[PDB]
Amino acid sequence: GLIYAVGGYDGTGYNTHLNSVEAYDPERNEWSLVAPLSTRRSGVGVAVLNGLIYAVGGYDGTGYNTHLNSVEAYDPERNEWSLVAPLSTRRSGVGVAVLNGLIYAVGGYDGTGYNTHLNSVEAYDPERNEWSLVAPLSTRRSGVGVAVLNGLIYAVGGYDGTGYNTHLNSVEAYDPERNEWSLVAPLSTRRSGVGVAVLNGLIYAVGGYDGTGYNTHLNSVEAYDPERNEWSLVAPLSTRRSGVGVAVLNGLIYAVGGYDGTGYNTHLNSVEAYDPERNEWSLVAPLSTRRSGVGVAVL
Ligand SMILES: [Ca+2]
Ligand SMILES: [Ca+2]
Ligand SMILES: [Ca+2]
Ligand SMILES: [Ca+2]
Ligand SMILES: [Ca+2]
Ligand SMILES: [Ca+2]
Ligand SMILES: [Ca+2]
Ligand SMILES: [Ca+2]
Ligand SMILES: [Ca+2]
Ligand SMILES: [Ca+2]
Numbered sequence: 001g002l003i004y005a006v007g008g009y010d011g012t013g014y015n016t017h018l019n020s021v022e023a024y025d026p027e028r029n030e031w032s033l034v035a036p037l038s039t040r041r042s043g044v045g046v047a048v049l050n051g052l053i054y055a056v057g058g059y060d061g062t063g064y065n066t067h068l069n070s071v072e073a074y075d076p077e078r079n080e081w082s083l084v085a086p087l088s089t090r091r092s093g094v095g096v097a098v099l100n101g102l103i104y105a106v107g108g109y110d111g112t113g114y115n116t117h118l119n120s121v122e123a124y125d126p127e128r129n130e131w132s133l134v135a136p137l138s139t140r141r142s143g144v145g146v147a148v149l150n151g152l153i154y155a156v157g158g159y160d161g162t163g164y165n166t167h168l169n170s171v172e173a174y175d176p177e178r179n180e181w182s183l184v185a186p187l188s189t190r191r192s193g194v195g196v197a198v199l200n201g202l203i204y205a206v207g208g209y210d211g212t213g214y215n216t217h218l219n220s221v222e223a224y225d226p227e228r229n230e231w232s233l234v235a236p237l238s239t240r241r242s243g244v245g246v247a248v249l250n251g252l253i254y255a256v257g258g259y260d261g262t263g264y265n266t267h268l269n270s271v272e273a274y275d276p277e278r279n280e281w282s283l284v285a286p287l288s289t290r291r292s293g294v295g296v297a298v299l
Helices: none
Strands: 003-010 016-025 030-033 045-049 052-056 071-075 080-084 095-099 102-110 116-125 130-134 145-149 152-160 166-175 180-184 195-199 202-206 221-225 230-234 245-249 252-256 271-275 280-284 295-298
Touching: 003 052, 003 245, 003 252, 045 102, 045 295, 052 102, 095 145, 095 152, 102 152, 145 195, 145 202, 152 202, 195 245, 195 252, 202 252, 245 295
Parallel strands: 045 095
Antiparallel strands: 003 016, 003 295, 016 030, 045 052, 052 071, 071 080, 095 102, 102 116, 116 130, 145 152, 152 166, 166 180, 195 202, 202 221, 221 230, 245 252, 252 271, 271 280
């Protein structure tokens, strides 16, 4: 029952992309560092499946200077990472979610091979160690938030630096039974690097960067109600954060790290918890290391 913060980018302290990993214990309000990844990765997608944490893709701007297709799995019982089958396509800022026993890697940016933001989508089957491409998004999206609700995968916001050259407020839902994406109600604000989590039947979109309309890193937060196809703005964060990791644990939404390129001009180690019963954010123990583009999962 811990929050894991996987990789990221420290553009303030060490000026480096991170392979380090920390785990948060909410009962004691303590972060602690565990086994690091084999590869430094910012913009890394993180999902939990079969008791393992998967770190999918990312960007290594320190060691290899490349966008990554490699994938690693973390076993908390032995404190070991291990590399598994890589994606068909390199992807940073990739969204990851788990549905029906498969890991979906949604969109991202390939700044190494194809030099393009991606609408493609791949599913990983752990029983066979195989990735396979499925129906692509309607719109290319990097820095895209992804969450699963009511048997559907939602792709929230992102940045299309290839087709429309715009940060996106649009939202798509994937139906695995028919291999179809469909566009639904868009956000009030365009957001790339947006954190997405599901709590109490609602999708929360946390922070992000609006480089198109407001030209600002965001502290605002929106909740999506699928029964009515409506987004609504709720209590904002204490700090603006793009590339923020978001996870749900014990009824609270945790917003982990990120980048404030508007107010403080710094990468963040701070962490906030959202209480939906009171519509309140509150700051808790910060990470040992500042990190934006950080992957967050709960296990
Ligand atoms: Ca500690
Ligand atoms: Ca290992
Ligand atoms: Ca390139
Ligand atoms: Ca395959
Ligand atoms: Ca472009
Ligand atoms: Ca469709
Ligand atoms: Ca702009
Ligand atoms: Ca609304
Ligand atoms: Ca700035
Ligand atoms: Ca508060």
